């Protein structure tokens, strides 16, 4: 369709994000391509509870490029913003390969 899906229904996944969830994950929303995932509450003490992760795509001469990590949000076909909302899971928690913000 030539643009990042705004949301789940367009992506073709469970229209409610919360339905898509994990043992320790709350929900998964599509946000203009950027896949944000929200964590559950207790299950760990750790400073993750209700916190967010995002996954960051980008076309690289077709070849798409997936970076996890610091929450981001898309605005245009390749423009994405650092979605600094305080739901940034800390970099310790996060991967190392994906310790990648909006470049």
Ligand X SMILES: *[C@@H]1O[C@H](C)[C@@H](NC(C)=O)[C@H](O[C@H]2O[C@H](CO)[C@H](O)[C@H](O)[C@H]2O)[C@H]1NC(C)=O
Q: Are 54 and 73 in contact (CB under 8 A)?
A: yes
Fill in the DSSP letter of residue 88. Answer: B
CB of 62 to a copy of itself, least distance (A): 2
The answer to whether residue 95 forms part of the interface with a copy of itself (CB under 8 A) is yes
6 contact, one of ligand X, a copy of itself, none, CB 5-8 Å limit per kind: ligand X
85 contact, one of a copy of itself, ligand X, none, CB 5-8 Å limit per kind: none
Buried b (16+ CB within 10 A) or exposed e, 54-89: bbbbbeeeeeeeebbbbbbbbeeeeebeebeeebbb
- Report the residue number, 35 or 83, with the smaller CB distance to a copy of itself: 35
CB of 29 to a copy of itself, least distance (A): 13
Q: Are 55 and 33 in contact (CB under 8 A)?
A: no
- Residues forming the site for a copy of itself (CB under 8 A): 1-3, 9, 12-14, 19-23, 25, 28, 41-46, 49, 57, 59-68, 77, 91-92, 94-99
């Amino acid at each position: 369709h030539g643009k990042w899906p705004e949301n789940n229904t367009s992506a073709g996944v469970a229209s409610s994000p919360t339905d898509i969830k994990g043992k320790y994950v709350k929900e998964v929303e599509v946000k203009n391509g950027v896949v944000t995932a929200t964590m559950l509450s207790s299950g760990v003490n750790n400073e993750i509870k209700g916190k967010k992760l995002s996954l960051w795509a980008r076309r690289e001469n077709g070849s798409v490029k997936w970076f996890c990590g610091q929450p981001v949000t898309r605005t245009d076909d390749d423009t994405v913003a650092d979605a600094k909302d305080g739901k940034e899971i800390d970099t310790k928690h996060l991967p190392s390969t994906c310790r990648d913000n909006f470049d």
